[PDB]
Amino acid sequence: GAEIPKEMLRAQTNYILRWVLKQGDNYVYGIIKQVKEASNGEMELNEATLYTIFKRLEKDGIISSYWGDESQGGRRKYYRLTEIGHENNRLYFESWSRVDKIIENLEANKKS
Amino acid sequence: IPKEMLRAQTNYILRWVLKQGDNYVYGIIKQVKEASNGEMELNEATLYTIFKRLEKDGIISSYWGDESQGGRRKYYRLTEIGHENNRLYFESWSRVDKIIENLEANK
Numbered sequence: 001g002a003e004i005p006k007e008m009l010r011a012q013t014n015y016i017l018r019w020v021l022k023q024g025d026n027y028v029y030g031i032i033k034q035v036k037e038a039s040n041g042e043m044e045l046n047e048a049t050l051y052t053i054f055k056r057l058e059k060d061g062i063i064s065s066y067w068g069d070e071s072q073g074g075r076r077k078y079y080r081l082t083e084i085g086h087e088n089n090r091l092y093f094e095s096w097s098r099v100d101k102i103i104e105n106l107e108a109n110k111k112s
Numbered sequence: 113i114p115k116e117m118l119r120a121q122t123n124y125i126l127r128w129v130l131k132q133g134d135n136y137v138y139g140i141i142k143q144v145k146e147a148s149n150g151e152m153e154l155n156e157a158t159l160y161t162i163f164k165r166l167e168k169d170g171i172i173s174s175y176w177g178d179e180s181q182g183g184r185r186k187y188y189r190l191t192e193i194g195h196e197n198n199r200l201y202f203e204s205w206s207r208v209d210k211i212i213e214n215l216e217a218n219k
Contacts, residue, residue: 098152
């Protein structure tokens with residue numbers, strides 16, 4: 001009776017958000033709506049966890065925001081990976097790919 | 113490329129290894145080095161750190177192993193509640209994979 005850790009739930013939310021960011025520019029609710037629809041029945045999205053990660057990536061210069069137009073009031077905030085954020089994200093998926101391969105190799109060693 | 117793997121990556125690998133049975137820190141490092149063709153050397157201090165955190169909540173226990181070549185290693189094992197935790201850990205990550213498939217398919 002030891003619950004799975006908060007750090008893991010954050011890591012999984014991080015993975016999903018980064019995967020969505022990898023697909024291209026988007027508005028925040030656009031991301032959220034896509035994740036909720038895909039998550040329904042699989043995982044309860046913690047909106048606060050998602051928000052926290054979003055804000056951290058922005059503060060860290062991995063994503064930057066812009067407006068879809070220049071008329072104040074009622075706009076959707078869009079976000080894109082920056083120069084360094086693209087690099088960070090590519091490293092993130094590459095490093096997880098290396099893990100995936102190690103697990104496959106461990107599985108194959110175990111079965112030998 | 114950063115000096116260390118992400119904690120979540122080290123945890124994933126450690127939990128996969130321990131799912132297979134009891135092990136000691138050098139042994140886990142050696143098996144993961146082998147499985148990576150020498151390319152991934154997990155951080156021994158990180159492993160000890162993770163084990164201390166898991167032992168705190170009863171997920172892992174430890175003991176001094178059978179003597180080999182003049183001494184004993186400190187083995188770690190998942191307990192019964194630890195295998196439960198581990199199953200829920202891997203299940204949650206399986207759900208991530210399903211979510212990604214749903215995003216890919218737009219369904």
